[PDB]
Subunit: 447 residues, 4 copies
């Protein structure tokens, strides 16, 4: 009822029945005037299984697109189904076999078995739901989906082509696609007396060969009925065939991000090998391109487009432990830190890179969470995690006297200038303790 | 004349007539030496109908690409047509079936009936016009145009396939593609005596089969005349067949559909397996991405394309009526509201989410467009659309005592904390009215 | 000799001969043991025309990739050709027909006629040169090029398939692809006695049908020789066939910039029609997207990558007349203007847009070349072409008191702040006359 | 063991052996009930050769994806193989032809010879490895891999096509695809007595024809066994056929080749038809774009991907030897030269161009890497590589008296005017040496 685990099992159970009922119906329609007593029980179970699905759907939840909620009211639940393809489900569930024999073996009633072909859309829904899964490769599930539609449309065409051969009396077998078919020493002289699986394989062989446009021509349309359907089936399959090529081509042009990385990566080797060499230069631009792959991370970050309330929770969950441990904010109010943790952006620096230089104006505040940095003036001070630098450039407005270089791979948190003062002027009281902590540490002697 | 509704129905009625005359001219050219008396009245109606269109084109409008304006001057409209494809239309309107019989049943005269094939271009122009429709994708329209062209070219090829078999005398029937045909028991010994809809179906079966490159070989080009045209038709079809595949791929490449959702979930996964985020926050963000692809996302659109000057007008058209109904802005000046409206941003909240909590300071002001919310302290107050919340934290600088939870999907307009004080500081008198309205309600 | 107009005519003349010699050689190879006396003269003219090309190439210029120059020295000119496919040109020019009859009608000598198939590469070069032309649509010339390669490979395969039928004696005609071919009432009983154009059309019909993978099967490979070539030809054509589909697909996915504009353009109507309406709003975002198309112009500009010396000449040719007419630079040295004209970037503003506001810091200098602007404080001053505004924000460092609005479509030249002072401090003398001109105009009263 | 050159030749010699055993196993399975004595020595060599490879794999290296390091420990290498596809290789090495004859000529035993088809994966691994090569495009390698796979699958299908005809007794030859075959005069009445290379060619002709979906129909699936496998092979081929088309398009889409030049000439044309630029400047820029696509452009590359710290190292590796040889920097400190080297930019000049003119002030400093230039005042001085020019205007602030024209294509390093004074102002002592060097030369 809430679409729990039990309902999901049923949707998998009916999906198996949907695969059977969609495949068996054209075989029943074309190759069988009336099902033998052996298959009487098999169809009874199939209709009963779908009949139970009709009752279960009356108890299923209701998913409405505009409001995005699970509404449990029964009156609204029934209403939706009745307008939305409930007659077709009842019509496909009716015993069209029993009515066919009861009515007097009238073939126009048996044309109504083809409404059970709607049950293949249930399998199509399962393929669409499989596409929504992140784990399953998109190219794989868009190939199986279009190799099942091609297979199903081929199975249906194979069963209707045989039916068009049975639309004539047995005296006119020579004017059919099968009664006039001789393959090797075998002659399909009386095709209605041949066993079922020879007729189906011969029909399915013709449809598959037509489906891939191989077209041997050993089996071909002879009648005017068969020619018209062949034109209809070929024209439809040609559009369907171009869709399979188009979908597979589109999923290869839209290659994985790893291959897009390789395109840029291999091109840069083309740019150095024709110009220079080096065990270190070649091994350092590779590091730089893997750092561009690490930035492919910060871009997801920027996109985000999640409400700021959740994004604030992301900022609070990750960066709050690191910010609270810095000596800069010793004694500061937790609220002031809360407005701080929101506005940092994560930037990664490779070992050997130069963060700062001597006497250069600073536009960003940096906090260290991972790795070791060096302040070179000789290493003035080795930077540990939770140790911030560049505070002199912000509070004092004097450029950093010491150049900053990266010794090990670092996860550095970036804070912008104009953002920082905006918080500072709003919380002027919190500004004093920041300066008081700086006074205690000394090493600056500037205010 | 002015491209009014009648002229938009005239060019829609000729399109119906053009479809008939495009699909009947090859049928008349191939399978008919002379039209029967019964079909005489039908074709004479179509030829007359296209004659009226010729007259109406002289009176319609004149569109010039350079000026992008319709010049209604009669002399300007006339000169254009006679220079641009008017002789072809006049030639097509000639009673070429009547002239055929009057000239002495000369097949050379009947060869020129094929100029009526230009009327498919009128159908093509409709497909090009349908490309301009915003509702229907311009790449799905090209799919239908090539499907129709392949359907039309196959139909034209089928009628020329049969005509080449009629170019030989009946004594040389065995040297044709249809005269030597024997499908099953049926033998096309004297095909000229066979009924029309069996010859066309056989010819169209041959044309359709090679159009998809199936090539059964039951029907093939026996004669040297048919071999050449089969090569020409196949070669042209091969180019046209690859055009459909190219346009099919371009449709899938452009209309990524769920690929735009699959790729976003891949980047979001990377951002969220490197951070060890808990399952509770795991579900919240993922559900938002699920919502962003079901109803197709508007913030993305607005960014996608505007400067600030008219982005305010977009905000003014969309957000002003809801902001004006807020009790907080009761008695406030229009300019104060107008400048506020510019800076709103829209956020959608899935049901079950929590916006604020107990004793939590928030830096955003929220106005609800749709949905129903509830203040939880028990439900303190159910929030109606146009009932703002969050003013307590923004103005009084005290965290919200209650949590505003979501039970109905809501469209929420966001105004930042820092932006709001700047508006209050400038429009200080308007801020005083806000305080008075807050005092009246509390 | 300098590759003048006369040489270009010859390259078009030999191209006609290349089309003939490439098409006629397989027809000569397969369908002819020895050319009749009627075609004796025709081949003599063909070889003579290519023989003259051998001498002319010894006099043509020399294009070397590394140095990009036309070197006229004869000794270097002949050297290049001799190593680069001169033997093949001589070999294809030799009278292999006359040698074939002279040697004693030996068929192994006639296998050497196929080196004249290299002459189709001359046509391929003309197709590659056509691609370099800007005017010709790229999709068109990449379709004709791959429809000529397919046509040529089909013409060649049609002429070699017939040859494989003649490799057997006439007594074994029944074991060939043509001697055992009956189509309708016509029987190819003695195919060597049939007229040439029936044999070629039958062979070319088979190759075209195989080329498009239609495969009727009326004409098929019977011998072991014909089967092996059919496998070789089909496998090669399958790769070639997928290249034609791939090239046509790639040139449709890479659509024109107009269609890319339409994709963004149509999407924005989807974003307003579902939200709001308006005769003006809808008609103003269209203006904004056509302004984004006008910026597609400034992006070409930014790319540029032309040496700065030429780009300086572009700046001097266009913006110098407009800059000299401004009252701001009255009496300034031409050299100072020369360093000015380089650094402006062209930006376009639509009517109704807001350029400036009251009391806002300015980061760019603007000059007006086209259109009319309004200074609203009421219109303080209507701006004409060659009238600059924002000078107060630069020289005085006071924000513009008047908002700037666009009345008519304007071509506005943009100058950056830090760039302008850099020139000002370098030419301090030129700074005085700029301030003196500002003093004369008054309307500012600030320095 | 260490993935040395011998092991890189061993895995290149087995690849030769793998190609033989991948293409001979279906041939042995289909057309051979039992191998003749002559081919016994050939196959016993291949099976022995693959047995040595099994032993060598235990002694080779062990590559782990997580650590990206080669673990040379013998026990670590052993455990990996036996768990990962070792039983298949051992099973393939079994003398399945000898066991077939010894067991009593049971076709069920011979059915398991098809596990030797796994050796194509070794060939596939080589194609995947060849994708990593920078010289050969990774998308052109995928083209060859699918061409080989289609060639291999067609070869495998041909041998299974013939095998299904041998599953029927010789009395039921007419019910097979080959027994009922009659091509021209030749009748495949008793195909088992036909020579090997006529049966394989007939089988491969059938397999090749349907691989490209040509489908002549001269050879087709007569039996029910062949109908099923034809459907299976055709269905698998249809997926594989569209894979080649998809990879063909991706190659053309990615390798735009001249499209990168056509698109640039289109944007440059727009920038230059809206400006009424003269023909003389028209040719100069167009020729530069022609040069930019002939030798493939390096400035574009460097931008494409570097930070500043190692972009200096790229400049230091490439430009330092040429800068150090400049007579202007004679006696200058290394640090002064090192900081200069960072700020050079490269410009290529087509022959015939003019760089400066009479009395023209320029703001760039030029060092020539390649080519030959000439100062025109008559040629004042022919410029050799490593001979800088433009110092007169940069230092003395006087426009160049002479024009430096280009007669040889030159690679020119550019240093800006404003950048150079900042270097001179900081390294003032180095600037004095520059003045002394200028005085010595003049
Ligand atoms: C999924 C792909 C194959 C699933 C087959 C399911 C059909 C089924 O069970 O009914 C068999 C029935 C017949 O069973 P029967 O009861 O006539 O024996 O239907 C078919 O014949 C389906 C054949 C499908 C072949 C194409 C693959
Ligand atoms: C592109 C098409 C250009 C066709 C040019 C053919 C060259 C020629 O002289 O053909 C006649 C000669 C023979 O003419 P003939 O001299 O034997 O008479 O060559 C051919 O037959 C070429 C046939 C090409 C048909 C394919 C198109």
């Amino acid at each position: 009822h809430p679409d729990n685990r039990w309902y999901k099992a049923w949707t998998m159970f009916i999906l198996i029945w949907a695969l059977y009922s969609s495949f068996f119906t054209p075989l029943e329609f074309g190759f069988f005037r009336g099902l033998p007593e052996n298959l009487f029980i098999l169809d009874i179970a199939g209709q009963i299984a779908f009949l139970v699905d009709i009752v279960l759907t009356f108890f299923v939840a209701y998913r409405d697109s505009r409001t995005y909620r699970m509404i449990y009211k029964r009156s609204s639940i029934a209403l939706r189904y009745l307008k939305s393809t409930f007659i077709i489900d009842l019509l496909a569930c009716m015993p069209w076999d029993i009515i066919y024999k009861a009515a007097g073996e009238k073939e126009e009633v048996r044309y109504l078995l083809l409404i059970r072909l709607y049950r293949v859309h249930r399998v199509i829904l399962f393929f669409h739901k499989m596409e929504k899964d992140i784990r399953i490769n998109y190219l794989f599930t868009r190939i199986v989906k279009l190799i099942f539609v091609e297979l199903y449309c081929t199975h249906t065409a194979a069963c209707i082509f045989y039916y068009l051969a049975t639309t004539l009396p047995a005296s006119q077998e020579g004017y059919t696609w099968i009664g006039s078919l001789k393959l090797g020493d075998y002659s399909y002289s009386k095709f209605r007396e041949i066993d079922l699986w020879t007729r189906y394989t011969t029909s399915m062989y013709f449809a598959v060969v037509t489906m891939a446009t191989v077209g041997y021509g050993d089996i071909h349309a002879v009648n005017m009925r068969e020619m018209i359907f062949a034109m209809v089936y070929i024209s439809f399959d040609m559009i369907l065939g171009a869709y399979l090529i188009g979908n597979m081509t589109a999923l290869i042009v839209k290659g994985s991000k790893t291959e897009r990385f390789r395109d840029k990566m291999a091109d840069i080797m083309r740019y150095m090998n024709r110009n220079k060499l080096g065990r270190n230069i070649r091994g350092q631009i590779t590091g730089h391109l893997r750092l561009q792959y690490e930035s492919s991370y910060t871009e997801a970050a920027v996109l985000q487009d999640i409400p700021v309330s959740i994004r604030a929770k992301i900022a609070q969950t990750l960066y709050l432990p690191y910010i609270e441990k810095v000596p800069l904010f010793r004694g500061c109010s937790s609220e002031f830190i809360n407005q701080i943790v929101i506005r940092l952006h994560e930037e990664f620096f490779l070992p050997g890179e130069v963060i700062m230089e001597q006497g250069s104006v600073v536009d960003q505040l940096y906090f260290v969470c991972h790795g070791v940095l060096e302040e070179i003036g000789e290493i003035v001070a080795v930077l540990q995690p939770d140790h911030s630098f560049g505070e002199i450039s912000i509070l004092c407005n004097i450029p950093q006297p010491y150049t900053v270089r990266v010794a090990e791979l670092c996860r550095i948190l970036r804070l912008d200038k104009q953002s920082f003062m905006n918080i500072l002027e709003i919380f002027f009281h919190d500004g004093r303790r920041i300066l008081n902590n700086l006074l205690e540490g000394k090493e600056s002697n500037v205010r």
